[PDB]
Design a protein around this ligand. Structure first.
Ligand SMILES: [Cl-]
Ligand SMILES: [Zn+2]
Ligand SMILES: [Zn+2]
Ligand SMILES: [Zn+2]
Length: 264
């Protein structure tokens, strides 16, 4: 066919504990739930394809199988390497991984400023780990911004919005449209270079933090080679060649009927 679905995952842990009170990051699920999805896909005729097969399809080099599905993992959590990757290898499932590049670029001796707190560097993967995963041929490296996976103050009353989608209010004023666009263009361009130099491939997908984007962000990403962009459930079916790619956001309540209705 000419259609494909996309699933969006974040962290995956061995812990089967109920998660609501455990202080993980949002949308963290259990490895059992992940396996259940991986089993349900293959036992229902869904074929996991790599991003390369998508690109090969749009370029008229090969066709996709029926009920094509892409798997995607956001943020750069060490669980990508420690929990997810062994499972991808066991299933021979490829995937797209979107680490925040300034998090990875943080030296091992430093914490990562993250809203009100500072995180141990090994919450996240190292670049050695990313190289190994990419070299397997199973994992495509996408961008998830360099350092725009945070909020900015978006008004004088102290409202905070994702940095990608809001001119910043600081020094008692709003960014100019030109300042705001510049902020996205340079961050995205540093992300592309940060990934390229470790990995050998410029990323060719932008994955938006929190699913949120706009026209300025799209054009900023496009300028650095990321015309394909991954959002969340604001679009369900993707056709070969689409720039705007929708995804299902996975959470601990995502059961088979949820996945089925989406992929239907
Ligand atoms: Cl997301
Ligand atoms: Zn099975
Ligand atoms: Zn995400
Ligand atoms: Zn994210």
């Amino acid at each position: 066919m000419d259609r494909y679905g996309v699933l969006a995952y974040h962290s995956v842990v061995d812990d089967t504990a109920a998660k609501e009170e455990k202080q993980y990051f949002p949308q963290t699920i259990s490895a059992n739930l992940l396996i259940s999805h991986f089993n349900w896909l293959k036992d229902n005729g869904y074929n996991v394809v790599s991003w390369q097969q998508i690109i090969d399809a749009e370029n008229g080099k090969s066709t996709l199988p029926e009920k094509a599905v892409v798997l995607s993992f956001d943020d750069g959590y060490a669980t990508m390497y420690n929990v997810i990757y062994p499972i991808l290898k066991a299933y021979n499932y490829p995937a797209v991984f979107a680490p925040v590049s300034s998090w990875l670029d943080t030296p091992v001796n430093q914490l990562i400023p993250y809203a009100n707190i500072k995180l141990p560097r090994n919450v996240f993967v190292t670049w050695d780990q990313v190289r190994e995963m990419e070299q397997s041929g199973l994992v495509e490296i996408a961008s998830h911004t360099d350092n725009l996976h945070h909020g900015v103050r978006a008004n004088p009353a102290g409202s905070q919005l994702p940095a990608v989608v809001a001119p910043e209010y600081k020094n008692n004023r709003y960014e100019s449209k030109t300042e705001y666009k510049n902020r996205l263009v340079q961050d995205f361009s540093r992300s592309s270079k940060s990934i390229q130099r470790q990995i050998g491939k410029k990323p060719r997908i932008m994955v938006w933090p929190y699913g949120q984007f706009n026209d300025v962000a799209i054009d900023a990403a496009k300028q650095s080679g990321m015309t394909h962009h991954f959002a969340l459930g604001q679009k369900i079916i993707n056709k070969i060649g689409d720039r705007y790619v929708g995804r299902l956001l996975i959470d601990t309540e995502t059961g088979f009927s949820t996945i089925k209705n989406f992929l239907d």
